[PDB]
Subunit: 359 residues, 2 copies
């Protein structure tokens, strides 16, 4: 479902608005579809000097898709705070009886001066679901390869090992790399490592990009004559279709691990994460780390991962990017570093070269 939060100092006047245009209340809203609305009874208790309990707030705010600030009076430090926390966590938001006629019109323009969308209380809702859809994050879909990485007439090389796809088939990352290169009017050349140096010596084109499997990148590292020819791999490309920038930043936090630090493995027969990874993390750091294995369909509760020093998400678990971003965003909001199998495994050997797309 979609998560929307309803904050505000007001108690009775807040609960009234919620129930408008029909605790968490799950109800269908057009054109956004199903959504669940949760208010802030824990946050109702206004802090010292009329402030909002920020650390108690960021405990309930972290998992919101978007936000709502329902207000009766003029902006107090409470309304100022809630807004800053939405802005910090990058949670998109909107600001919302007929008392003080024309002042309500003023208030709409008063709350509009702090650079955000203000809608008026009706006791009008056609515009509630309408604005929610417009502030909500969009498609957020990036091209398989880099936007300017491949142009027309460019040779791209795909270097496979021993395909895991059945007889007369190739794995989806490969074919998608052939298609995107073709869509961008470039040339796709697929060849096994064994015959790589031969294609590098017989063709005339210098490869713009070269892609291969994490298994044989080192062999390819030697087959490509220099740092001049940009090499990366099918796992970093797929990892790219998520949040590479955050992940790459988060792997570099492996060094920052001390004894007793908790590293969470998020997956969902003696798998890489349950066993093989921990082993490498301990071997690479020397640290007496402990690991929480979260095998669930959706992202865990705050109580299940609060205090974790790193989150290792599974690579090819195949969710919607937007459903994976929701996960990245939450981790980014809780300040917990998050990466995935692909980036970690690559980090251990040669990740820096795999990073061909600069920030």
């Amino acid at each position: 479902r979609r998560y929307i939060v309803v904050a505000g100092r007001r108690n009775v006047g807040k609960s009234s608005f919620m129930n408008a245009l029909v605790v968490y209340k799950s109800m269908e809203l057009y054109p956004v579809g199903p959504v669940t609305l949760v208010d802030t009874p824990g946050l109702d208790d206004v802090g010292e000097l009329g402030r909002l309990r920020v650390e108690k707030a960021r405990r309930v705010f972290y998992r919101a898709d978007c936000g709502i600030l329902v207000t009766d009076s003029e902006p107090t430090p409470y309304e100022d705070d809630v807004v800053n926390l939405f802005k910090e966590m990058e949670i998109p938001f909107v600001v919302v009886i007929d008392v003080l006629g024309e002042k309500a019109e003023e208030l709409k323009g008063l709350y509009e001066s702090r650079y955000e969308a203000k809608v008026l209380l009706v006791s009008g809702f056609d515009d509630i679901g309408k604005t929610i859809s417009e502030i909500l994050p969009g498609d957020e879909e990036i091209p398989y390869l880099g936007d300017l990485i491949d142009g027309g007439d460019l040779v791209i090389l795909v270097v496979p090992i021993d395909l895991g796809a059945p007889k007369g088939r190739l794995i989806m990352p490969q074919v998608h790399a052939i298609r995107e290169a073709l869509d961008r009017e470039a040339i796709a050349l697929v060849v096994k490592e064994r015959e790589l140096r031969y294609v590098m010596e017989n063709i005339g084109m210098k490869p713009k990009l070269v892609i291969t499997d994490s298994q044989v990148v080192m062999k390819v590292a030697s087959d490509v004559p220099e740092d001049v020819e940009l090499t990366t791999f099918s796992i970093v490309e797929s990892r790219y279709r998520g949040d590479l920038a955050y992940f790459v930043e988060s792997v570099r936090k492996i060094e920052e691990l001390e004894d007793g630090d908790t590293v969470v493995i998020m997956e969902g027969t003696e798998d890489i994460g349950r066993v093989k990874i921990p082993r490498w993390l301990v071997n690479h750091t020397g640290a007496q780390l402990n690991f929480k294995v979260i095998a669930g369909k959706d992202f865990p509760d705050l109580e299940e991962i609060e205090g974790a020093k790193l989150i290792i998400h599974c690579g090819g678990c195949v969710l919607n990017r937007a459903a994976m971003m929701r996960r990245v965003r939450m981790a980014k909001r809780l300040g917990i570093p998050m990466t995935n199998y692909g980036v970690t495994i690559s980090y251990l050997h040669g990740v820096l070269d795999r990073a061909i797309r600069p920030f």
Copy 2:
């Protein structure tokens, strides 16, 4: 199901054997599975000089997977004939009370001297289904590309137009051509026609094979410098996985068409076969041809296609090769020439070049 025929001059002694180890009789037999057995009551009436009614026989024999010749006495011209018709139609077969003890053992060796498998009457059946499976046609699967067409270090070029496969995908014939080339340690290069001449001038390798769509073969015909570079197309390759030799032979029979000749279209929104084809066939020959459109799941009855001068089967209807061979074999047996959309369409423009695999 599997079709097996039970022939022989004998009437009561034939019907007895059939009913052994439990008109068409459909029953499960190990290890061949489900099969239907049909005898020859129409053929029971022995012809002039003890002969078999050959033209009446080849009317019921054409659709058999394999054959059975049940006999009581010594080989008469009837037993001689049935055998020759099985041999002609290439229908694989086996030869089958305890009367004339040891003579039955002799008979087994007498019927064995005419170069075929003889099994003895039991009134022993473990060996019936056992032999049927061994004579029955095998896998009959050929490699996607030519067996010796591509070896290691060989460049193969796949030239697409505007893919009919959804976003981030390629059509199955293409990917299977990438895989087979990779399996054979060759190099697959995929590029649009627009950038073809550029790859032909910048790379060092001479392409062993070049594959493309029937739509742009002519453009490629010009982009490939000579007859020295072997060009063909994804449709001829797929047509190859059927009976290319027979098809190619059968298209050349387009010229042999006169006014009144019936051309059958076998398919199963204003499709190519129902309309577009007939139009071309009439335009290319000038002949006043008529067309029977057989839209069925399985191959039609003899009465539905007897007298047809050509059968145009559908190209990408996706059946098992062995289930398509069964169709080719039947047409080959009835002496009706058979081809498919792919071969006809290609015949109209440039099929001869597409034929890179010699007989």
